[PDB]
Design a protein around this ligand. Structure first.
Ligand SMILES: Nc1ncnc2c1ncn2[C@@H]1O[C@H](COP(=O)(O)O)[C@@H](O)[C@H]1O
Ligand SMILES: Nc1ncnc2c1ncn2[C@@H]1O[C@H](COP(=O)(O)O)[C@@H](O)[C@H]1O
Lengths: 177, 177
């Protein structure tokens, strides 16, 4: 039943990120939790999903038709869903998930994070939103978001909607039912 | 017929931002260009629509069923498209416009911008994506994205698609057919 969606890089392979993603996947799978992720075998997406599979967990991949070849659709997922549009991927992911973990990534990861955060802050769902950042990948973003908060562009209840942690033990504890 | 979509705040309290959204509305309309916007008649959103209408410009407003009252749908929109879902708002907004201008705003504005920018560099559209930021509102975001490019998380293709200008003049020239 309990399902966690992990959003993470689809482009670059720094080993420390693949490590983190593989640890993440294996920890999810050990709690009898399902993995939902962008359904690609590339990069951190492949590290989290393949790890979760090899450790005994259910894996659900959600990937746009247009991105099937670029991000290597994972036909090895226990269920794979190919959405007609980019927008539908995020919708489907967010609906099947109970909680969200975001790992280091770039624009794609951030957009996925923003799409669930927004829906959260607008009060459209009651699901924990976690960022796992052991080496301050997101420092620069968070310093920015704080400025916006201080200057009245992002509300206080909106910042308190983001749980940002440095360790995998806290991310999982923040994600639990 | 040429259509520019403008992303800006729907939350209120910013005087310099109101004037900027007004000048933008006015500048689009006077050029014989249609305006697309989130559909609300208050704060920045209302300032861009009423300023476009006052210069005899056609205004199209796109807004989900569940935000019609929160963000106060503009009934003086020449056309109002009320979408079934959050995601459909972005879809319709991006198909309808030939270019995009993002102005200072919060999390939703940012989401809207990352949505057209990803959709862009991943090759869904070749429409130009402008952030107009005369006061360095977006400094933090950029210095950071720049850290992400220096470490391989964001490609040089993607960065170049994000046109950032410090004045309205360059903004509209970048949006011109
Ligand atoms: N607008 C979007 N809708 C759905 N998925 C997205 C969107 N933008 C980016 N992504 C995903 O974000 C990841 C890109 O990774 P990166 O840009 O390396 O963080 C990929 O899994 C993309 O499929
Ligand atoms: N997930 C989303 N997709 C499209 N538009 C959004 C989303 N979340 C917020 N918005 C809108 O972005 C605009 C600016 O909001 P903000 O900048 O958060 O004050 C508002 O019209 C929000 O309703």
């Amino acid at each position: 039943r309990w399902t966690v969606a992990v959003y993470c890089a689809a482009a670059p392979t720094h080993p420390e990120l693949l490590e983190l993603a593989g640890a993440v996947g294996a920890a999810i799978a050990a709690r009898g939790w399902t993995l939902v992720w962008g359904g690609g075998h590339v990069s951190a997406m492949g590290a989290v999903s393949s790890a979760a599979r090899a450790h005994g967990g259910w894996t659900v991949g959600v990937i746009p038709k247009m991105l099937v070849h670029r991000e290597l659709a994972d036909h090895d997922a226990d269920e794979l869903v190919v959405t007609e549009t980019m927008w539908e991927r995020k919708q489907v992911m967010e609906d099947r998930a109970n909680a969200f973990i975001t790992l280091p990534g770039g624009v794609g990861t951030l957009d996925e994070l923003l799409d669930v955060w927004t829906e959260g802050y607008l009060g459209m769902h009651d699901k924990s939103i976690v960022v796992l950042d052991p080496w301050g990948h997101f420092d620069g973003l968070r310093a920015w978001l704080s400025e916006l908060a201080d200057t009245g562009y992002v509300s206080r209840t909106a910042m308190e909607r983001l749980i940002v942690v440095d360790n995998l033990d806290d991310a999982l504890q923040a994600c639990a039912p």
